[PDB]
Amino acid sequence: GSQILCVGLVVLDVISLVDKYPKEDSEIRCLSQRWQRGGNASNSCTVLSLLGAPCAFMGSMAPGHVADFLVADFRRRGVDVSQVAWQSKGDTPSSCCIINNSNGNRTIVLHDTSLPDVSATDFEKVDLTQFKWIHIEGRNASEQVKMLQRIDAHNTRQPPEQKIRVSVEVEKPREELFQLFGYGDVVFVSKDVAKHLGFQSAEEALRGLYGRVRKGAVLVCAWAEEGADALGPDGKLLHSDAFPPPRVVDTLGAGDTFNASVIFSLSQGRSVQEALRFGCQVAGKKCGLQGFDGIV
């Protein structure tokens, strides 16, 4: 088990870099434009690859010239596309990303093409013996739970030595996804999902939502400039201060850089404290760079 699998989205991010965020009905002119391979799992993959970890992407892709750019990006990164669930009905999703240069804030206007999501069926044809770790980006909850149950089942039939570690990301404040809370050894819950539940801090969110996690699972919550916090079976709250760059220029994919760096550090067998710190470290380095090149 040498690879890390990331199940989720691949999107074409059409990035416009603005000197100030536009006012409604205004006609701003951007400083620079760029095309970049997006989607949470696709970003985590980039980050993992840059960190030296052999990784594989699994997500739906619609053949076309857009997919040709995305696939070429994965291949240039060394991201294994073999497990890609190629669809026939639909187009590859795209998004319009306004990056405010003065603060690094990112505004994503997503076009979800209604492409069929990766199903338990697509997941059943996957050889789980090559994977050290598997990360699922919370989208089709009910169907992903079937992929999650399939991993638990494989793990029981395996020695503690060659067991697959699982991580789950709850990013959007969707009720269907709160069932995944749930599964996986490491559960990543976004600051957005936390505020949706009436939690005003990462520690509030952790203490409040730990009940919802599997026995032995680590619940992780990043809180932008406030750093990130973790809560494991011991009940001890772990915290990492952020690593902000002096000039924050691009936060697009920062949360993904966080996730992949926590998964990476924990995959390398480091403490949750060390992994929390490293997550913040790599996410913070990224926030001072455009794209993902230069974080290591």
Ligand X SMILES: CCc1cc2nc(C(F)(F)F)c(C#N)c(N3CC[C@](C)(O)C3)c2[nH]1
Residues at the site binding its own copies, with contacts judged by CB under 8 A: 14, 16, 18, 21-35, 65-66, 68-69, 91, 94, 96, 98, 100, 105-114, 172, 251
Q: What single string gives the DSSP state of each residue in 199-262?
A: --SHHHHHHHHGGGSPTT-EEEEE-GGG-EEEE-TT--EEEE-----SS----TTHHHHHHHHH
Nearer to ligand X, 195 or 207 (CB): 195
Pick what 14 binds: ligand X, its own copies, none; C-beta below 5 to 8 Å, kind-dependent.
Answer: its own copies
Pick what 242 binds: its own copies, ligand X, none; C-beta below 5 to 8 Å, kind-dependent.
Answer: ligand X
Nearer to its own copies, 110 or 249 (CB): 110
6 binds ligand X (CB under 6 A): no
CA torsion sign, 176 to 179 to 185 to 191?
Answer: positive
- Binding-site string for ligand X from residue 239 to residue 258, where x marks contact by CB under 6 A and - marks none: ---x-xx--x--x--xx--x
Considering only residues 167 to 196 of the shown chain, the ones binding ligand X according to CB under 6 A are none
Query: How near is the Cβ of 81 to its own copies at its closest, in Å?
Result: 16
Determine how β-strand 106-111 pairs with β-strand 94-100.
Answer: antiparallel
Q: Which two tokens stand for residue 134?
A: 């598997």
Pick what 110 binds: its own copies, ligand X, none; C-beta below 5 to 8 Å, kind-dependent.
Answer: its own copies
Sheet holding 237-240, edge to edge: 55-58, 3-7, 131-137, 165-170, 186-189, 218-222, 228-231, 237-240
Pick what 127 binds: its own copies, ligand X, none; C-beta below 5 to 8 Å, kind-dependent.
Answer: none
5 binds ligand X (CB under 6 A): no
Consult the annotation and say whether 138 binds a ligand.
Answer: no
CA torsion sign, 15 to 19 to 24 to 28?
Answer: negative
What is the Cα 166 distance to its own chain's centre? 13
Query: How near is the Cβ of 294 to ligand X at its closest, in Å?
Result: 14
266 binds ligand X (CB under 6 A): no
Query: How near is the Cβ of 43 to its own copies at its closest, in Å?
Result: 13
Tally of residues, the chain: 296
Q: Which of 225, 181, 267, 232 is nearest to 275 (CA)?
A: 267
Pick what 65 binds: ligand X, its own copies, none; C-beta below 5 to 8 Å, kind-dependent.
Answer: its own copies
Determine how β-strand 94-100 pairs with β-strand 11-18.
Answer: parallel
Consult the annotation and say whether 255 binds a ligand.
Answer: yes
Residues at the binding site for ATP are 106, 224-227, 253-256
